[PDB]
Structures are given as C-alpha cells and as structure tokens.
Write a protein that binds this ligand. Structure first.
Ligand SMILES: Nc1ncnc2c1ncn2[C@@H]1O[C@H](COP(=O)(O)O)[C@@H](O)[C@H]1O
Ligand SMILES: Nc1ncnc2c1ncn2[C@@H]1O[C@H](COP(=O)(O)O)[C@@H](O)[C@H]1O
Lengths: 323, 323
C-alpha cells in the first residue's frame, strides 16, 4: 500500500529517463559499439545524506548519487547506459522516497542513462526516525579499443581542471563538524544563496561534456576528485616517477570552501586533503590540444582551465606541487 | 587503514569469483550471445539481516544476498554475469565485513557471476552498535529471442516446484516476532540442527539447474517465491483467467515452517501468505515435459516435483487453489 503509492508516484520520473535501448529490467547495448565492454560501479552519497536529513531537504540528493556513480564511469571512457537504486529506511515516508527518486531521475537524464529498476526496503529498528540510506549502481559501455587506462599519460602533458559545483559529495564529515562546533546558522547568506544551499548544491555531472571531449581529443587520463580531496585524487592521472605541477595562479577556491575554512578553524593542509577546492575533474592530455579542449568543455557548459602540467619527479618528492 | 585491511582481506574471495569475461570494474559479454540483452536487478536480504545481527553470525548472509538477486534474474532466462555490493555501517568492523563479502563470493560462484566491485561506507550516527546494511546488484545476459516473458503459458501446463532451503530471505519480520514473543531458545535442536541454524540457512541458488532446464525444455514461466509467500507469488506464472491448482498431496512443508507455526500461534492462512512453505521456484511447462524436467532438476542437485497444473478460472475465484 505505501510501496504502491510510491510506485505510482515515481513511474513518471522513471519513464522520463527511458532511452531507446530499454525494453519492456531489460536493456540492449547501444548499436554503435563494435566491441562493447561493460563498466560498472556502485556508490552512495555518504555523510552528505546526513546533512540532507538534518535539513529535511531530499529533492537533490539523488543527483549527487547518480553523479558519484557516473563521474567515476567517465574516467574510463564509459557512456552511462542504465542505473538502479536501493533505498533503505526504517519506516517508508512515501513523499521523501519519491523526492529522492525524482532527483535520481533528474541525474540520470543529465547522465544519459535510464533508471531501470530499484528496491525500496523497510528495515524497522535499523534506522532511527526519518533516516534512510540510498545506494546507486550504474552500468556504462565503452568500446574495447578505446578504454582510457592511463597508459598514454606522458611527462609534458597538460592538466585541465573542470570546475565543481561545491563540495560535491565528499568532505561532509568535516562539514558537519564545522557546522556543529560553530553552531552555524545555515540561513546565513553568502554570495546570494544561503550556506545550507551552497552546502547541499548537487554534484556537477560531467557526462555530456566528458563524452564530447573524449570523442574530439586525445585524452590520456581523467581523475574524478572525490574522497581525500584535491590532494589525494590528482595523482590518479600520474605515471610512476611523475608529479602534477599545479599553477596556483590559475584559480580561486570557490567561496564556500573559504567560508568552511574560516568558520571551522581549518588548516589549508586539511582543506586540500578533504575537499575538491573547486576542481571536480582533472584531465591529462597533450599541451597542443589543451586550449581547444578547454573551449570545448566551456561550450558544453563547464567551467574549465589549464591548471598545470605533468613533470618528471625525483624519488623523494610529493606527487602534487602547487607553485 | 581499516578499508585497507578489508581490501587486502577480500581480494582472495573476489579473485575466486573471476570469470574469463572480466578484464583488468570491466566485463565483456559472453561470446555465445548473438543478440544479448542485459537483465539487471538490485535486492537486499531484509529482516533476515536482523536475525544474523541478533545471532552475530555473518558468514552466510552474503549467500542470501546473491541468491535473491540471481534467482530473480533466472525467471527471464538470464545468465548471471557480474555482481556488485554496497555495504554500509556505522563503524567498520573489518572481520564482519570480510565475512559478509566472503559469503557474497560463495554465492557468486554458485551463481556463476563474478564479484567485480563494491563499496564499503561508514555512516556514523545512521547505524547503531554493530549494525550494517548490504545491497546487492547483478547484471545477467539473455539472448533476445529467448527471453522468458510468460506469453507461452497455457491452460493445461504442468507446474513444477523446486524445493527451498528454508524460509530463504522472506517472512523474517514474522520470524523475529515469533522468536521474541515465545522467547525461543535458538539452541533448541530440531531434526539434527539448531533452530538458529535452520532459520539462518542460506537461500538455495537455482542458477546451475535453472540454466540447464531452460536449455533442454520449453519453459513457459518461472516464479521465484519471495515476499508474500507461496500464495502471492504462484500467480506470477498465470495468464489472466487462469488458476494454479495445487496438489496438496504432493509435498509436506519442511519442519521449520511447522515449528514456526506452532511456536508462533500462527494461522495457516498467514503462513501461506508469508513463507515459501517449501517451494522456492514454481515453473510452468508442458505436461509432457514435466517428468523429464523434474529428473533434470534432481540430477542438478535440486529437490523437485510436479506440484500442480494451470486450469481455466472463473471471474470470481482465487488464482491459487490447494486441493
Ligand atoms: N527505489 C526504486 N527506484 C526505481 N525503481 C524501483 C524502486 N523501488 C521499486 N522499483 C521498481 O518497482 C517495481 C516493484 O519494486 P520491488 O518489488 O520493491 O523491487 C520493480 O520493478 C522495481 O524495479
Ligand atoms: N564491499 C565490497 N565488495 C567488493 N568490492 C569492493 C567492496 N568495497 C570496496 N571494493 C573494491 O575495492 C576498491 C576500493 O573500494 P572503494 O574505493 O571503497 O570503492 C574498489 O575497486 C572497489 O570496487
């Protein structure tokens, strides 16, 4: 009965996401692939969900869920194809679940994948109050010969940054600690939006721009900047014996990160190892294609810029250097 | 560090499940398919997990997780290909998580799918004590022309039952209520095993036998008996205007169900609408193939029998009739 109200309630959102490969959860492979390989992953949104629960605002958290999954697929060159979610809760609140699922559908549309199935589970005793937990699962497709595996990254490659929408879905344990110690007023305005708005802003989805970029340029590696922040994730594009030399003149941290550091008495050292600091993706490619790639990304709605280059590194040194 | 102990700890279990299609989470389609269609699903284990947590016994619950997912795929004719899990907890207990994941690997091997990825998430504040929640996701493959869609079911078809291992992963809310009201001693012996053992017995996986059966016989429909028990799930094989006429002489409920009914003061009416009552799958096929199908299922390690037939039904009547 509750799950019946919900099923009817979301069928619109689900149908919105349908792509022609979907049959009748059945899905054909897109016809363009000659040697398709499936690329899959699962993710949750983490402590960001705790903030959404604190704020009782559930309409965008599904976008973060889809984003986490799909932005990890694009790093290998995969085109998202379909998506499923598992939603667990103590007592099913149909409005809440419908809001979450609708935001999942919003994300799926921006990622170009169909929401084809899912599960809503009641686990009384496991979740307190109005809490729920949601897991996402995505399957994408890549042409076998075109997998981006990082083998092509060279010393001398340029590094492009693609701008983030805010903290995305990482660092939210520190966010919540900052908010609780400072007893922060989430209604405070900063640059025309409330602090709560800035912090719940959904993760940017990089599929439309990413797929176009990969099609038009020689992309050597991509890193999706997630747990461990800017500092930990940049090295995923680096061969052994190299470093990312970051041009510190090339961007300013988005103001929400500056606010978090000030409000929270946080070191820059910790900030860089927790938050994306404005960088959602970093891309390695030849220097002579970097400006064209940047223009393409911008044309597809991203913020993008040349943030650095890959240099030879000695045995001792840090793999990320800001200068 | 905790997630590092765990990753090393499970890599053996994961490698055990590898199939040749896995590359390097990357997976090719099996070569035999001419027009492959992907079939996918997500599931959790439900309140059975609460029993495993009550009993602090985590080594088989992953089998139930895989079983729930894969036994739903086989109903459409799909061959499980790969599997991913999302494990969420308040504080990561590496031994617990490793036990769960190893049991997932056990299930994957029996289902013939590779465990190719997953996520372990810490959500402090969301889960109390040692609680965790685990979601499963599976992708299988079916030849487009060979999808089992139920269109072939006929009045006059035989119905075969495939025996369950116990309650599988459904009815465990009622199980726990029975145990709590009766203050049942889970160490009590029944037919050579403890009550706790009977109730945690992992769900039977029907892939090896199922795939062979579909290959060798004209299977019209299959229903995996899950939520709502024997009574609610049998009608999934039925066209409009038909009923399942069940031969009540053809089996005896496994003793654990009789124990649950007696201990719990439960009506037969409720039992049939909650538990599988010994039937894990029901299969519709031509009568002239039923005996051969039964022998095949038995040769592949199942318990199986002809449990009834599909008859014409009048407007008013129940779709399941035991006589
Ligand atoms: N949270 C969800 N997201 C997407 N689809 C769902 C969700 N919950 C249920 N469904 C779909 O609705 C139908 C009934 O769901 P269930 O029997 O609970 O898995 C199935 O086809 C599901 O795939
Ligand atoms: N519960 C799990 N089951 C299977 N694989 C996992 C699990 N947790 C982590 N992994 C794998 O271990 C690596 C590190 O995990 P993570 O970065 O937490 O997703 C990834 O390749 C995961 O796919």
């Amino acid at each position: 009965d509750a799950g019946n109200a919900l099923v009817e309630r979301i069928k619109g959102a689900v149908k919105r996401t349908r792509r022609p490969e979907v049959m009748g959860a059945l899905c054909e492979l897109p016809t363009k692939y000659k040697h398709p390989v499936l690329v899959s992953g699962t993710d949750g949104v983490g402590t960001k969900l705790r903030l959404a629960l604190d704020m009782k605002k559930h309409d965008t958290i599904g976008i973060d869920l889809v984003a986490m999954c799909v932005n990890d697929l694009i790093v290998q060159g995969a085109e998202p194809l379909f998506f499923l979610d598992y939603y667990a809760t103590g007592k099913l609140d149909v409005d809440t679940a419908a809001e979450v699922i609708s935001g999942i559908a919003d994300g799926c549309l921006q990622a170009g994948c169909a929401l084809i199935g899912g599960e809503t589970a009641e686990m009384p005793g496991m979740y307190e109050g109005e809490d729920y937990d949601v897991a996402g699962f995505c399957v994408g497709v890549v042409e076998k010969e075109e997998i981006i595996d990082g083998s092509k990254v060279q010393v001398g490659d340029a590094l492009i940054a693609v701008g983030s929408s805010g903290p995305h879905s990482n660092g939210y344990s520190l966010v919540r600690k900052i908010l609780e110690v400072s007893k922060a007023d989430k209604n405070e305005r900063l640059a025309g939006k409330t602090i709560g708005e800035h912090l719940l802003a959904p993760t940017k989805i990089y599929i439309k721009s990413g797929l176009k970029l990969i099609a038009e340029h020689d992309i050597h590696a991509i890193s999706h900047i997630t747990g461990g922040g800017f500092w930990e994730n940049i090295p995923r594009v680096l061969p052994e014996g190299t470093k990312a030399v970051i041009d510190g003149k090339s961007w300013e941290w988005p103001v929400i990160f500056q606010w978090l550091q000030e409000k929270g008495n946080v070191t820059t050292h910790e900030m860089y190892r927790t938050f994306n600091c404005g960088v959602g993706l970093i891309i390695a490619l030849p220097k002579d294609q970097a400006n064209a790639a940047v223009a393409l990304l911008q044309a597809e709605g991203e913020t993008a810029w040349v943030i650095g280059e890959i240099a030879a590194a000695n045995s001792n040194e840090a793999q990320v250097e800001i200068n």
